[PDB]
Design a protein around this ligand. Structure first.
Ligand SMILES: NC(=O)C1=CN([C@@H]2O[C@H](COP(=O)(O)OP(=O)(O)OC[C@H]3O[C@@H](n4cnc5c(N)ncnc54)[C@H](OP(=O)(O)O)[C@@H]3O)[C@@H](O)[C@H]2O)C=CC1
Lengths: 499, 499, 499, 499
């Protein structure tokens, strides 16, 4: 006998054993007499149109697929709960944090960044870590990564970056020349690249990695006072990674190493959990902060800004039907309950538009009416009507315009957002030449040891070696801007691999 | 105090008087603070992206519309029940007819044919009459008209025929020459054209007309014995028409005369009723029938085949939301429960493919999971999976392939189809030159009185005058082929209209 | 012998007499043997799946329809050129205004607001007047109306306003309680309501009405200096209106009166033309303006701001296919060539988002590659790829990421936008009670004569008649704020309409 | 200096050196001023909506993906020509076979079956070999595999087979119980399974395998005489296979081994080619044939029916843009030019519906107007109009109905199909118990040698060992029904693999 993943159908049969099998019907609910044989004229004659059983099944098979996620396609899923363990009501007035002990249902999806639906799991890439909270004040979507930082700091570059990471427009192959030519021309990627090419680029499953909000957010309390914050949900199972040697073996042996691994864990009772922290910065402290506090390529050092604990995330349930429950998941950074708000972070600004837009394409205009996406612990009432695939009462015979004298839904004045003062020329400001190396230098010298740095340069050199010599020499000097020995250690490796 | 239609919002406020208004939220359930004023920089400044209240409200408004029905676009809807009053179980084994007294829920839609969503109700056109029966053996959809016959008798001419009835491909106008250029080249339409331009072309609302299944269908009883049948469903309110004089006046004064009429009736307790009847033809009678028993341009005379009563359809409930309940209604002739089966009628065979096809475009692949389209009085179980906008559990983790050794749904042998024998060359057989005049001649001479024949020709000449003269005299020729006196009473008038 | 429109088919045959008719083919180009008869087993036997001729045609008929426009569904189109008559290079650097004599191809669409694809033309409602310019600096879309003003001055009320102008969500009938409940609660609409119920509410065709850009826009010259402006294109054919008597007869007699007229004009050589003017306001003149200069409910008086002529608009070409060239037209206010830019107008800012979004839904993601929508007078080169229905080379094997060291397209610094300084709070400012009556007080007393004031109230009283007494008393009070005698007239008519 | 594929961008810039790079523009053709920095209020302020450069780009990045193919999603592409070398005009009157030396433009797509977009190329599975011929009488799609047979022989079992080959609906993992439970319950798969698990399961790229039409097809010559046939493509590069050991290594070392191998071949001039053969069987010989001649699980032995040469397929051009030219390719078996027609093959009859159906969803209703899908060597003229994304003149102001008196396209009587007559009860005939063993026993004993049979069982036993014991015993028994030793060899390995 085998692992719980392999016995899915086995267990389905026994969990039903007492009952008789159900009647096999068409999509209109009409029972079928034969579904192994086609309706023809004579044993060796042509098929008939009158066979509406054949058409109904085949027509639905033809439309099984939907457009896959533009990024983060390869994914695993689970469900669970969030429990508050410490009081942070002085910072936020959000209902999700109201009192210690309070539980709220969650949903989580894991993913890579570049690989398609059929791609391998154990490859060097950032990891997706999206969490949906089902609160009474509507859903809260915290769409984070396994890294506190990202490769760029302007939303106009995101389409570009992605194109550089995927397949050549002509040959449809992954192209090292595309990969590093973007990175070498944009040194602000030197922070996140350094993260990606040492040990934590390939995590040993999804349960042995941390998760970060990365972006700075705003918190607002009852008194109407505001602060900025970071989110860090760290693993209780502890950080554990794969070696380059055997992570490559799993790519062919078991492409879904993580997918299987997550499912197996929950089914055998070992429910994975994470501990949620925040960091806090006042508007005054934002004014004296050395770098831009909304530069996504920057962290807040722990010395200057310690972690404040909030609660635990626990996943304790596997999905029943993957497509209906994990593939149709939609997370929107714009989904924020009263008390939590976005900062002027340029990269976060761009995510407010981009996500709701693509969902309307990928899933459909009424994608928020799908069960897993629905805000089922809140009362949705508005003046929105109609759209393709409307599934509920459509809010009945209620008036559909505002304002009105007929007692349709009303505003809630308390739920107004925070007021900030801004001024300056409305202009495209140059952020390409913000500090690209300081926090990177710190990472290299202070955080890594002598062999981790040695392994770090091997992993880069093993990937950069395929680019053109002008790209190589351009990238090396970018690495030299962090540390002379760092650039030179990479360069020593490249010189022999170029024969 | 005004008519019940107009006092919809007045009544909605009364039903809610005790309650206080709901919290206005986004689609993702977050309450909005202010939804009358925009988020800007300064009192006379620009708009921000950080306003997600605006973006998601506007984006949903953008996508309100779905493609209208390709035909029968303008529509009215109601709900009620089907009640069995007589026993016809010797003919059929369908659960909808299992015993006297039994009630079944129904859904009805009334419509014109050509006009678009904004067209007038009171125009000369056929009238759609669709009934959906929610049986325990799945949904049964009886999709009929207010005429026992149609304009053509082969499926390949349908798209063509429709185009001719709609708008010119360059000018986007109604074009008389198109209409009659088609009708004169296909003389089989004489029968349905003669019906259309009589008094019953323009009925006084939807409650004052009969319904007809038109097609020949098959009935099967428990023993496996089969008969052919027509469905005749007559009004209890009695036939009542509008003159062309007041029909033209109502066209501008009230574009939705029928729509209001139906709603007002149901709201005031004035429930509309029609009786269902059948005509039966044995397989033996079919072979000796002087005409083609499956010709959609032919009727079965009452003398040789009297009417057998079955039951009552009553409408007693108005829709709560028009879009969700009436505009998303789907009817499929292919939805046929055991006991009811198709005949070889050329036209009906085409409609098995067409309707499931078009609905997957208009509404979506998973359109059958829409409440009003859902078979809620049956259990759907099969091996169909995924597709955009999947709305239930997706049948859980149940095995998705057949056959299987894991007790997934099984076929029911009881539900096999009636087996018939056939012979002939597989080829395209010409139906142009079946008898096109005889049944028309009796209608003119035997059924109509002297005054009705006069108006019939006035109405044609009043419409045919707008075509070219070479088209006119070819159409006139067809009218003489029915009867010499018929043809030239029309011809005498056209020559008047030609100055 | 009849109008040129009705003789569309007649001409087509004459234009092709010398040629032989084409071979009738499937969509895939395969020649059809017979397309009047279905492939069946024996003369009275069932249809075959093997009939691939049938399916191909039948399936495309099923998907003929696309979602109609959410607003301004009923439309008419034409084509022509714009020609410059005076030099205003001192105000704008846009190449469309480079020198006197320069022509640019245009595309125009006329439309109503509320009516659907099948509605009447001769009805009281605003009239759309969108113009597309095909410049070398990309497409410019000026999407204006036949009025200088609108009903509301914040885009958050637009979805709500439209709902009130359309059909009730339950009854699917037009309801005057919805109309006047909205209008009476929002007295800022007093100005545009006065315009609509005046003589110019029902224009005599599309050739006898003015057109306005309505919004304040920003012009920029070669030195970098900027000014604000309004766009007026006044009729050369003259203003002419229809009586309430004449408009109502036409509603049923000719629903497409506007579509027929415009087509007949161009076809017969009688080409309609407009003269394009602008108003100019400096940044200085903007600060001292008594009202808000970007308020869409406000006009700029001609005495203080005279009209400066630019050029002529001529329509000289009918569309070849309505659907391909007029119904698939898409206009984006966001389409602005260097030299023309948006003001901070609250209503205009919303339209920058709304239009490109809705077109991706209505038509598709690649709606800009449809021939009539394409910028064919510019060379399109960027880092955008793929999408459903990709129609060109897809920009070949060019690098798809930016920046790059492989000489893909570069940004043009000349096309940088004008930099403005703003300051103030970031919140939602209340704009509901800016001066709503003064300019309306001017319209009533100064522009109209005593006879036109009499008819104005009559048109108002005849439609306000249908509302509830409490909505009536609210509306009259709002009108009384404009002028006491104006308010007292309307109610004086209502006391006679209430028996 | 590297391989040609990786130097694609390098070559692209060299091909342009003389030219200056283009100006980077929006989709509307408007030049952009900067596309590296956003439009904000101050250096650390919020984003504005009036920035339409961001939205236009971001909204198109959001819609880049379309649904992948329901099967055969992973792909590679190339183009070339078909050249006739022998005369087969006595069998077919098709223009593609008119005379020796005749060229036709072709398009070819290679693929696996089960794997999604991102999966590895070198895996055990059937391989797709679709060819699209661009003829004068429309496009011919000969959609074939690398195997003469298939796993099933009824069109109602196809969805079920596919579901069993792909991912479990709960765990989203590949499931051996799903795979073999099916195969064991349908013993007809014994023939194709035996092929799959042999050497020719894993081909050494796409250049070293044969391709087969599998289905029996109909050929009709100029006289109207008819015969049945098979299509065979044999490689001119020779059959060549990978060991499972090397195919596993490449799975992680090179996920796109096949795709690049093809591209590198063409680019270096080394063009791949295949030789087209046919088998022929007269109406006389078909009735005396030992098995069913339209059984997709059966071959025609070469002893009785030898190969007849036709021509050569040559690939000498790579795609320029993969997505526009390979991802949007659509092959329809229903696309057949006069002279080629379907047999009554139950499976082929079903493929006549499925492929046009799925494309309407995947790509869109007008998917044939896409360049690569378009029949650009024939003239498409018909009475099909409108539909989403209409891209040409839409056939102008031509009459849109048939028949008509206005010289619109006419049927071509010469292109009527061959007429056969069939008889027998119209009923659902059981196909489960046709001979499942004879031809398999042949393949095992005659074609394989000692060493290949030895590996065949090893390759089977290596996969079947992961299924349950009740399934193993059921599968082995089906292998025993082929040959005692064949069953016995498998069970000998299973006993060791079961510890
Ligand atoms: N301050 C921050 O929020 C983070 C900082 N860093 C890096 O550390 C530097 C110093 O930060 P500071 O807070 O002042 O000092 P600390 O020494 O307190 O920061 C240590 C942090 O480094 C993380 N870390 C350790 N090894 C790796 C690795 N191989 N890849 C990625 N992260 C790793 C640890 O994660 P864990 O706690 O799980 O052991 C821990 O959060 C920064 O310049 C930055 O580059 C890294 C992560 C976050």
């Amino acid at each position: 006998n085998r692992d719980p993943a392999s016995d899915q159908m086995k267990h389905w049969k026994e969990q039903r054993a007492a009952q008789k099998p159900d009647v096999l019907t068409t999509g209109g609910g009409n029972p079928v007499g034969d579904k192994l044989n086609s309706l023809t004229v004579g044993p060796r004659g042509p098929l008939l149109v009158q066979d509406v059983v054949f058409t109904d099944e085949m027509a639905h098979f033809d439309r099984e697929r939907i457009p896959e996620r533009v990024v983060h396609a390869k994914g695993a899923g689970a469900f669970g709960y969030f429990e508050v363990t410490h009081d942070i009501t002085r910072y936020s007035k959000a209902k999700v944090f109201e009192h210690i002990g309070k539980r709220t249902p969650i949903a989580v999806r894991f993913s890579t960044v570049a690989g398609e639906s059929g791609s391998a799991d154990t490859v060097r890439d950032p990891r997706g870590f999206a969490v949906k909270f089902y609160t009474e004040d509507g859903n809260w979507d915290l769409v984070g990564n396994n890294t506190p930082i990202f490769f760029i700091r302007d939303a106009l570059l995101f389409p570009s970056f992605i194109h550089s990471q995927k397949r050549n427009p002509q040959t449809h192959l992954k192209d090292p020349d595309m990969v590093w030519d973007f990175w070498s021309l944009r040194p602000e990627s030197l922070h996140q690249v350094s993260f990606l090419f040492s040990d934590r680029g390939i995590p040993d499953g999804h349960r042995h990695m941390n998760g970060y909000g990365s972006h700075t957010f705003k918190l607002v309390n009852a008194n109407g006072e505001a602060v900025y914050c970071k989110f860090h949900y760290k693993t209780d199972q502890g950080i554990k990674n794969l070696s380059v040697e055997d992570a490559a073996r799993l790519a062919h042996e078991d492409p879904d190493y993580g997918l299987r691994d997550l499912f197996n864990a929950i089914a055998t009772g070992n429910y994975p959990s994470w501990t949620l922290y925040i960091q806090v910065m006042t508007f005054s402290e934002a004014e004296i902060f050395p770098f831009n506090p909304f530069d996504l390529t920057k962290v807040w050092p722990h010395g200057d800004y310690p972690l404040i604990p909030v609660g635990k995330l626990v996943l304790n349930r596997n999905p029943v039907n993957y497509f209906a429950e994990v593939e149709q998941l939609a997370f929107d950074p714009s989904n924020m309950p009263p008390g939590i708000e976005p900062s002027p972070d340029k990269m976060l600004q761009g995510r407010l538009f981009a996500y709701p837009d693509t969902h309307r394409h990928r899933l459909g205009p009424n994608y928020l009416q799908i069960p897993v996406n629905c805000p089922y612990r809140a009362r949705v009432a508005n003046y929105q009507r109609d759209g393709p695939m409307c599934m509920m009462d459509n809010q009945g015979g209620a008036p559909n315009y505002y304002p009105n004298s007929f007692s349709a839904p009303e505003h809630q004045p308390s739920a107004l957002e925070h007021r900030t003062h801004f001024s300056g020329d409305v202009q495209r400001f140059n952020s390409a030449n913000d500090d690209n190396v300081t926090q990177v230098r710190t990472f290299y010298l202070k955080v890594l040891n002598e062999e981790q740095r040695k392994r770090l340069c091997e992993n880069i050199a093993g990937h950069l070696k395929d680019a053109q010599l002008f790209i190589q020499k351009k990238a090396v000097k970018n690495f030299s801007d962090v540390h002379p020995e760092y650039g030179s250690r990479i360069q020593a490796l490249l010189d022999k691999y170029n024969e």
